[PDB]
Amino acid sequence: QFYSPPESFA
Amino acid sequence: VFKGPLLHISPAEELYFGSTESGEKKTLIVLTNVTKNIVAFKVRTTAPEKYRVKPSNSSCDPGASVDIVVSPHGGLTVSAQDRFLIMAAEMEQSSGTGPAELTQFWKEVPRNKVMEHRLRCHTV
C-alpha cells in the first residue's frame, strides 16, 4: 500500500 | 509532536498543506534523531505518482533534525485518502550515508529493527 516516490538523496 | 524510539516526528498525525508564495501547496515533516547513532530514514506514500518528497531516502545524525518538504506535482491536489510512511533504522557508527550505502543498508537491516510511523493528510 506504501510506495517509494521518485528517489531523492542528499 | 510524536516521540518514538528512534525519531521524534513533527507533525505527529496529520499533515497540513498550505499555499506557498508561488501558489504551490507544501507541507513540512521534521524528523529529530533522539538516539546516539545515525538513523537512516525512508519516506513512502500511498500515491507515489503524486508527491515531490525532498528528500525521501536519507539519514539523520545523532541529535540532529532533518526537514522533509512534501508537495503535489502541479495540477494535482491533496486528498484525504493520501497517507505517508516514515521508515527508520539505526546504522553502525562507521557506515557511510551515500545513496549506495543507504540502499545496501535497507537490504540488510532486519525487519524487526525498522521503525515505521504513519501520517495522514488534512483536507477538510
Coordinates of C-alpha atoms in Angstrom, one line a residue:
Chain A
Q1 CA 0.0 0.0 0.0
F2 CA 3.0 2.3 0.5
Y3 CA 5.4 3.1 -2.3
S4 CA 8.7 4.9 -2.7
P5 CA 8.4 8.2 -4.5
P6 CA 10.9 9.2 -7.2
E7 CA 14.2 8.7 -5.4
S8 CA 15.8 11.8 -3.9
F9 CA 19.0 11.6 -1.8
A10 CA 21.2 14.3 -0.1
Chain B
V1 CA 5.0 16.1 18.3
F2 CA 5.3 12.3 18.2
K3 CA 8.0 10.8 20.4
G4 CA 9.3 7.5 19.1
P5 CA 12.2 5.2 20.0
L6 CA 14.4 6.4 17.1
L7 CA 12.8 9.6 15.8
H8 CA 10.6 12.5 17.0
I9 CA 8.4 13.5 14.2
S10 CA 6.5 16.8 13.7
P11 CA 3.7 16.8 13.0
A12 CA 2.6 13.7 14.9
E13 CA -0.5 12.5 13.0
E14 CA -1.9 14.9 10.3
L15 CA -0.2 16.9 7.6
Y16 CA -1.5 20.4 6.7
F17 CA -0.7 21.7 3.1
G18 CA -0.6 25.4 2.7
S19 CA -0.1 27.7 -0.3
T20 CA 3.5 29.0 -0.7
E21 CA 4.2 32.4 -2.1
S22 CA 4.4 30.7 -5.5
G23 CA 0.9 29.2 -5.4
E24 CA 2.1 25.7 -4.7
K25 CA 0.8 23.6 -1.8
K26 CA 3.6 22.4 0.5
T27 CA 3.8 20.7 3.9
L28 CA 6.8 20.0 6.2
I29 CA 7.9 16.9 8.2
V30 CA 10.6 17.3 10.7
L31 CA 12.4 14.2 12.0
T32 CA 14.6 14.6 15.1
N33 CA 17.1 11.8 15.8
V34 CA 16.7 11.0 19.5
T35 CA 19.3 8.2 19.6
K36 CA 23.1 8.2 19.7
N37 CA 23.6 6.6 16.2
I38 CA 22.9 7.7 12.6
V39 CA 19.4 6.9 11.7
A40 CA 18.6 6.1 8.1
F41 CA 15.1 7.0 7.0
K42 CA 12.8 6.4 4.0
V43 CA 9.6 8.1 3.1
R44 CA 6.9 6.2 1.3
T45 CA 3.4 7.2 0.2
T46 CA 0.2 5.7 -1.0
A47 CA 0.3 8.0 -4.1
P48 CA 3.8 7.6 -5.5
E49 CA 3.0 9.4 -8.7
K50 CA 1.6 12.4 -6.9
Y51 CA 4.1 13.9 -4.4
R52 CA 7.5 15.5 -4.6
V53 CA 9.3 14.3 -1.4
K54 CA 12.6 16.1 -0.7
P55 CA 14.4 14.2 0.5
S56 CA 12.8 10.7 0.5
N57 CA 15.8 8.4 1.4
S58 CA 18.4 9.9 3.6
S59 CA 19.9 9.8 7.1
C60 CA 20.0 11.9 10.3
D61 CA 22.9 12.4 12.6
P62 CA 22.5 11.9 16.4
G63 CA 20.6 14.7 18.0
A64 CA 20.0 16.5 14.7
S65 CA 16.8 17.4 12.9
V66 CA 16.1 17.0 9.1
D67 CA 13.3 18.7 7.1
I68 CA 11.2 16.8 4.6
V69 CA 9.3 19.0 2.2
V70 CA 6.3 17.4 0.5
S71 CA 4.2 18.9 -2.3
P72 CA 1.9 17.5 -5.0
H73 CA 3.0 17.9 -8.6
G74 CA 1.4 20.8 -10.4
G75 CA -2.2 20.1 -11.4
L76 CA -2.8 17.6 -8.6
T77 CA -4.4 18.3 -5.3
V78 CA -4.1 16.7 -1.8
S79 CA -6.7 14.1 -1.0
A80 CA -7.8 12.9 2.5
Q81 CA -7.0 9.3 1.4
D82 CA -3.3 10.2 0.9
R83 CA -1.0 8.8 3.6
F84 CA 2.7 8.9 4.3
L85 CA 5.1 6.3 5.8
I86 CA 8.3 7.1 7.7
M87 CA 10.7 4.1 8.0
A88 CA 13.8 4.4 10.1
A89 CA 16.6 2.3 11.5
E90 CA 19.8 2.8 13.3
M91 CA 23.1 2.4 11.4
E92 CA 26.5 1.5 12.5
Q93 CA 28.8 4.3 13.8
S94 CA 31.2 3.7 10.9
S95 CA 28.8 3.3 8.0
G96 CA 28.6 5.8 5.2
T97 CA 25.5 7.7 4.1
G98 CA 25.7 7.9 0.3
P99 CA 22.9 6.5 -1.9
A100 CA 24.8 3.3 -2.4
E101 CA 25.4 2.8 1.4
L102 CA 21.8 3.6 2.2
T103 CA 20.5 1.2 -0.4
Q104 CA 22.7 -1.6 0.9
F105 CA 21.6 -0.8 4.5
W106 CA 17.9 -1.3 3.7
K107 CA 18.6 -4.7 2.1
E108 CA 20.4 -6.0 5.2
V109 CA 18.5 -4.4 8.1
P110 CA 16.2 -6.9 9.8
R111 CA 12.5 -6.1 9.6
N112 CA 12.0 -6.1 13.4
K113 CA 14.6 -3.2 13.6
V114 CA 12.7 -0.8 11.2
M115 CA 10.6 1.7 13.0
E116 CA 7.5 2.9 11.0
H117 CA 5.4 6.0 11.6
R118 CA 2.3 6.8 9.6
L119 CA 0.9 10.2 8.7
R120 CA -2.3 11.3 7.0
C121 CA -3.2 14.4 5.1
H122 CA -5.7 17.1 6.2
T123 CA -8.1 18.4 3.6
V124 CA -11.4 19.5 5.0

